[PDB]
Structure formats: structure tokens, C-alpha cells
Symmetry: none
Subunit: 228 residues, 4 copies
């Protein structure tokens, strides 16, 4: 009944070079501070101190967080071999009642809560139009579908929460998926998207400047100015 | 009698995620330069300016090529429906005396030529042992067979040329194929390999670091260093 | 106190060629039925028999409507010289308590009513992202702003109603505009968008398949399938 | 110095439904014979064998002509996106000393000649009065002007021949036009009509039953009887 946080931070983050040439993405800094720190401090300040960080590319640079925040680091040796599906596979049983977080995000405000009662997707609305995973939901905010597409709307923004019963249904797809031998290129998120029919997930529309994703030096350049 | 180039680049490139989530594999860059640019600039330098690029997945990202190199982009709306047999089908009439290229390859050296006089496959030798399409030829370099298999040897490496008489035989197979009703999974190469007996094709043994394919983030990791 | 309709239909419809070289867009047919007929029959069925159609390009092809529906056609001789600002100027006095309709739109449902009491824009939400005129409004549905831009949102969809007091303020802008000497490229809609601050306009969100615009032969192709 | 022909046959011919539902316009048949066959055979019998057919809508139904008459087919992928300006753009290099033909015309007689020495328009006289493009020429038959209008006179009838120098002047407009960004709606003929001042084109008055156009099920119904 205690809420923990899983942070996916193993990737190479090649789209951000030269910035990530000798620095993992998660530890890239804005307003003179590492990206992963903002989320760790927001998670702790909200009483979520059970924090597991999946590492890989340049993992030695994370070691100091154990001492500083008391985070549990976990090594994915296949961080360049597979996609983050495997990273989550590694801690596939800690999913229940835990937050899953894409480390490459800048959080403007702390939207975390240990009172969460159901599987949630913390969705921001992209007025523009880029290729993302889009959430298809009604007035009950229950997620009807997830669709990859290029357009505008509410997307999977890199922060979610999975309750025990749903997590259980998910882990069962992870096993089959893994044993299938076909998951290399799969995002852990494919488990939900391709099985959304069997799961009950809800959206939590965020607003204003909240979760800014940095997938390229240009974004880093934008968020830079937004912070002006 | 003018040599033209057809570049296949409409695929999802899923085996390259996350690198290819918001960037076509064809446009992924090595040494701050899109893959497709090395090939186009190589083609041009050798006098081949009649370039037709088939696009689909994230097509909008190719638009700047038109203005920059004077290329022609063609949209395959079934790019996620069918294998690249359909991509070639769309331009099946521009085959004769044209090069056909797999855009997801890195070329170390410009092995192109507008003087080519016969159907050629620029094959590389794979000393290791992976599963590919192996070229079976004698001392005349005339292709005797093409066999899918896991081993070492000379392989279809993503670059070839087709003369008018050969293209004609091919395009006739493409038609029956199309009208057959079944061609979803066929690579356009299934046209040759499955009728190699009726065609006259020659091999052009490449050597050293010539054509480097990136079908996975590891290869992309490798190639990086090779260029160290 | 009687509701009348004003249908703009004088345009060249060049973006629909060849479909429109010998037929006005307003008369192009979907399901063996001219576009303008769907609107007129909907307007009539809800008691709006006071219909005024401005025509120009290929005007002679509208003449049968007079006999068939009892509509009044008004000839805009500058239909190729000026944008529809002038088309409405012609009938700027019949504005009060009347619908203003862009003829080049298909209507899936009859959203016309003779009980309207305030100025309304019947809007559709565009999930994709094209360049249009966007409606900026609150929870009162009172229009706060109208912006030209390319994105998603609620857009002016070619159907609106204007009440006496609002029509009065608008007609006063038309006059000044006309006598200003510059109005060649102005949509009649410019009168509202550029004085939205002095006017009280409300939105009436439309849902589902309601108002489909055919501004190109592709759309005409789409709408085709939609009705599959 | 060899004369070739370019037949434009990519459009959708919607105005001809139901006749063109599962048949391209060029392959709608009169006297159990496809329209494009009459023009191909007249063109051959006069020694013009260098025939390039531009296809699109239902293109597969043309493949047989390659074997049968040895015509070269060409695929315009934007056949429903743009007007035939683009279709001609694809082969803008084969214009010089070549006939340009609108495949939706029934030829009563073979007015083709490989001896042509100057840009020509094989004009017919319409005693009636429809909206078409009219040739304004003097007694020297040199075209002074082309004007869209609704009346009687000599029109652009769907057959013409262009010489090297004129075609050279026309191709330079085609280029600026394309790079302009706006041609989406231009007929290839717009190049001639909106530049007629810079070109030397002549008229070749046809007489009696020569070229009958089928743009609608009404025309087809007429021609039917004329042949009675
Ligand atoms: C498509 N989605 C919405 C499901 C997720 C989008 O993911 P993406 O395309 O931005 O790629 P990304 O690598 O930046 O994914 C974000 C998170 O996955 C992590 N990651 C990636 C690959 C890998 N083997 N292990 C990981 O832990 C990254 O470090 C990063 O923190
Ligand atoms: C099996 N062979 C030897 C014939 C070739 C190997 O082909 P492959 O297995 O690497 O799969 P692949 O999808 O990468 O094929 C390479 C090229 O096909 C293109 N491609 C693929 C599918 C599709 N519908 N259209 C395409 O244009 C890709 O963009 C890529 O440039
Ligand atoms: C820009 N908006 C949002 C104000 C409206 C969009 O208008 P549009 O860009 O689609 O151009 P359009 O020509 O289709 O305008 C729609 C209506 O105006 C009519 N029209 C246009 C010009 C003119 N001189 N007289 C007219 O009556 C057309 O016939 C058509 O029924
Ligand atoms: C206005 N003119 C005089 C310039 C030509 C008249 O042209 P039209 O109004 O009869 O329309 P149309 O679609 O029949 O044009 C005739 C020829 O263009 C071809 N066509 C049309 C659209 C397109 N993208 N490519 C084409 O090649 C048609 O197949 C047809 O054979
Ligand atoms: Mg990311
Ligand atoms: Mg490949
Ligand atoms: Mg319109
Ligand atoms: Mg015609």
C-alpha cells in the first residue's frame, strides 16, 4: 500500500548530442540542475521515497544519487540492444501502485500524489501537431484508446501510475511478450497501447507549463527560453 | 538512355526505435548528415540527377530535399500496410536503366556509375554469419541464384542497377504479382530472387568499408566507432 | 422578425478544377444532388423560405432554383474581381436576423433553427491542423477573438446567424470598408474578425459529421468515402 | 527531329460517372473501342510511335497498351491532388516537337502529321455557346490571345503540337510555376494562356466531325447518336 516510483533513464539519448556525448540525458541540466533531480525531489517532497532508477548509458554518473537521495539504481546491460520495454521488464514486479517515469522530462510543477487510486496517465494537450501516442477518452476520462499519429490533442507525456490490479494484468502481457521473443524494439508502453481493451486507465489532463519533454537540442533550446 | 535513381525510404524503421520515433530511418544522421543525403550527393556527383524517392512514414520530413537536390518524392500510402514491393510498384515504369536503393544504408564510398551496361548487384562480403539473401555466382559473375539463409558470403546489400531488357522482364512479373492479389509481405526483391532463372544479373563485388547497413541501434552504435 | 438565409455562391471555385470548369462549386453534386440543394432543403424544412443566393461564375446554372425552391438569385458582377466581402455588401441590408452560408460545404445534418436569438457561429472542431480562422471563446461561449492560424481548434465553418443589433454594427463597418476603397481581398468575415471587440457573437459547437468543406478534389474524394 | 506524342489521361473523370466508376475516361469505349486506342492508332499510322501516356486513376487498366502498341506509361501520383499541370510537369522534358493530347476526346478523323513545323492548336468551331477557352487569331492564324469564356467560336480542343523553341519557352514557365508553390489548380494549358504574348502559336482550323469531347454522360449520349 506504499507508493513507489520507477524512472526509465537507460537510453543513449543520441537525438540530443552533442549535449549527451558525455552526459546521460536524465542528468542533462536546466536552470543549473540535473533533470532527474527535479523529479526525485518532487517525488520525495510528496512522500514517495521508494525510488527505483533504471540506468545504463553512462550509469556511473548516477551513483551519487544513492547517497544523496537514497534511490535504488538498477542496471540494464541491454540498454543499447533493446528499447525501454526491457528496462521495465527488469523491475516488472514493482509495477503495482507505482509511478513509471520517462527521465527525459522537465517538470514545471509537482503533479505527483501518493493518494492516487487508479491507473493514471498524466496528459498534456499539444495544440501543435507532432507524431505522438494520443489518448482517446470520453467524459469519464476512462481511456478508450491510444493511437500513434501526427496531430493535436492529449498525449502519453511520460508520467503514469499503475494500481495493483491493472499492474497485474500488464505484467502478464510483459511475460508473454518477453517469452514471445519479440519485444526488442517495443517500448514498455506497447504493453498498454496494444492491450488497452483489457485495461482500465484514466487520464489526468494537466494544464499550463507542466511536463516539457526534451528529445532534441531544439527542445532544450525552447524550454531554455520559456524559462527566460 | 539517361541513368536515374530510385530510392526506397517509406518504411517504419521500427527496429531502430527510439532513434526513429520522430525521424525516418532514411533521415537518421551519421556525422551530422542524413543518411539519404550521402546517397543523393553521391548519385549527383556521378551525373545521376533523375532521383525518385519513395516516402511514407514521416514523409513531411523529406519535402526539403525537393528544393535542395531537385529530387522527386512519391507518396506510398500503404507504407505500413505492405512491404516494399508496393513501393517499387508505384514507379515500376521508371525501372529500366535505373539504380534501386535501400535508403537505410551508409555508403563509405561512391560506387555509383552512369556507365553501367547490365543488371548489377553491388554485393559485399559478410565474413560473420547473419540471415540475409545470398548471391550465388560463377566466374562470369553472372548470378546463378539468390538464397535466403544464415551464413557468410556475398549478399544483396541494398544497391543495384537494372538495364532496360531486364527491367522489362521484371516489370512483367510485378504486374502478374500485383494482380495476383498477394504481395503484402513481398520485398520488391522477391521479383528477382523468385524468377532469377529468367533474368540475367551480374554481381559487382564491393570491398572494404563500402555499404554499411543500420537495421538496429547496435549497428548504429558500431558504424559510429568504425568512423571513430 | 422572420428568419432569412443568405448563401454566398459566386466564387470561381478554382481549387476544385477540373470538377468545376463547367459547373459552379455550389452546384457540384454529392450523391446525385447539388450542394446548394441540401442547404436550401434543410433551411426550408425548418421554416426558412426567405432565401437569397448571391451568384456569379456560371450564374445561368442557378436559374432553375427560382422555379424549384422559390429562392432569389442576386448577381455579383465583380465575382471574379473581389473576394466575397463584395458579395455580401450587395445584400448588406438583409443581414439582420439571417443566416450567412458558404455554398461550398456539405451538411450532414440540419443544424438550422428559426428560434435563434443571438449572433452565432456554428463551429466544428478540427483535431488535425490546417490554416483556418479560429474561434477564441470562454464558458459563456461568447466569442472573445478570431485568429487566422494553422493548428487545431474550433473554426469558422461557413454557417452563422446574425441578429438585428449585431447586423446593425457590422453593416456600419461594411459601409466604411466599402467607401474606404480597399476591400478587394476581404472576406465578408473580415468585418467581424477585425471588429470582434465591438460585437457580441456566440459559438454553437457542432459535433460528429456535421459540416464538411470541399475546398479541393481530395476533400471531395474524402467526403466521398465518408459517405461510403 | 522525331515527333512524339504525350497523352494526358490521369484525371478521375467524375463528371462522367457512372460510366467512369470502374473505368478511366481514356478507356471508356465508343463502338466497342477504348477512346485512347483511336488516338494511339491514328498517331502510329502517321508514324508517331514515341507515345508517352500519363496515368493515375485506375492506372492498372492501361498496362496492356505497353504490350499492344508499345506505349510508354507514366505515373502521376498526385492525380487527384492537382490538375493536369503536374501531369505534364512529369515529362516536361519531352515537350519539344511533340503533340499534347487530352485523352477524353473521340477523333472522327486523323488530323495528325509528323511534318508539323510550328506550334499548333487544332481548333474546332463551336457554333453553340459553352464556357471554354477561345482562340483569338488573325488571318495569319497566329494566336493573338486565349480567353476563357462562354460563347461560340474556335476553341482549345484537346490536340496540339509544340516545337523545340516554343516548348523551350514553355518549360521555363513550367519551372517558375512549380517552384512558385502555386499550380495545384493549373491546367498545363495555363502556361500557354497566361503567357501567350511571349509565344508564337498557330491555329489549324478543323472542320466537320473531327474531335468530339466527352466530359459528361450527355456528350457521350450525343456522340452516340451522331455515329448512329
Ligand atoms: C512513444 N512513447 C510515448 C511510448 C514513449 C516515447 O519515447 P521516446 O520516443 O521519446 O524515446 P526515449 O528513449 O527518450 O524514451 C524515454 C525514456 O526511455 C528511457 N530508455 C530508453 C531505452 C532503453 N533501453 N532504456 C530506457 O530506460 C530513456 O532513457 C528515456 O528516459
Ligand atoms: C531482404 N532483402 C535482402 C531483399 C533486403 C532487406 O530488407 P530489410 O529486411 O532490411 O527490410 P527494410 O524494410 O529495411 O527494407 C529497406 C528499405 O525498404 C524501404 N521500405 C520498406 C517497406 C515499405 N513499405 N516501403 C519501403 O520503401 C525502407 O524505407 C528501407 O529503405
Ligand atoms: C476564410 N474564412 C474563414 C473567412 C472563410 C473561408 O473562405 P474560403 O477561403 O474557403 O474561400 P471560398 O471562395 O470557398 O469562400 C466560400 C464562399 O464564398 C463564395 N464567394 C467567394 C468570392 C466571391 N467574390 N463571391 C462569393 O460568393 C464562394 O462561392 C463560396 O461559397
Ligand atoms: C480547360 N482546358 C481547355 C485547358 C482543358 C479542359 O479540360 P477539362 O475541363 O475538360 O477537364 P479534364 O479532367 O477532362 O482534362 C482532360 C485531360 O486531363 C487529364 N488529367 C486530369 C487531371 C490530372 N491531374 N491529370 C490528367 O492527366 C484527364 O485524364 C483528361 O484526359
Ligand atoms: Mg522522450
Ligand atoms: Mg534494411
Ligand atoms: Mg470554402
Ligand atoms: Mg475534357
Amino acid at each position: 500500500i506504499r507508493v513507489k516510483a520507477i524512472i526509465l533513464a537507460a537510453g543513449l539519448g543520441t537525438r540530443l548530442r552533442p549535449l549527451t556525448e558525455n552526459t546521460p540525458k536524465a542528468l542533462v541540466q536546466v536552470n543549473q540542475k540535473p533533470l532527474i533531480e527535479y523529479q526525485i525531489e518532487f517525488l520525495k517532497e510528496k512522500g514517495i521515497n521508494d525510488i527505483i532508477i533504471i540506468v545504463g548509458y553512462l550509469k556511473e554518473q548516477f551513483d551519487y544519487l544513492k547517497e544523496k537521495y537514497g534511490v535504488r539504481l538498477v542496471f540494464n546491460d541491454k540498454y543499447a540492444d533493446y528499447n525501454n520495454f526491457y528496462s521495465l521488464y527488469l523491475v516488472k514486479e514493482e509495477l503495482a501502485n507505482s509511478y513509471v517515469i520517462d527521465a527525459d522530462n522537465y517538470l514545471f510543477k509537482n503533479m505527483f500524489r501518493n493518494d492516487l487510486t487508479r491507473s493514471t496517465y498524466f496528459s498534456v494537450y499539444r495544440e501543435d501537431c507532432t507524431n505522438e501516442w494520443f489518448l482517446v477518452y470520453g467524459d469519464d476520462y476512462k481511456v478508450q484508446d491510444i493511437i500513434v499519429d501526427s496531430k493535436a490533442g492529449r498525449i502519453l507525456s511520460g508520467v503514469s501510475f499503475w494500481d495493483a490490479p491493472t499492474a497485474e494484468k500488464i505484467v502478464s502481457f510483459i511475460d508473454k511478450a518477453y517469452v514471445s521473443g519479440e519485444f526488442v524494439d517495443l517500448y514498455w508502453d506497447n504493453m498498454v497501447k496494444d492491450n488497452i481493451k483489457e485495461l482500465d486507465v484514466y487520464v489526468e489532463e494537466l494544464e499550463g507549463n507542466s511536463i516539457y519533454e526534451i528529445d532534441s537540442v531544439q527542445d532544450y533550446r525552447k524550454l531554455e527560453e520559456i524559462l527566460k
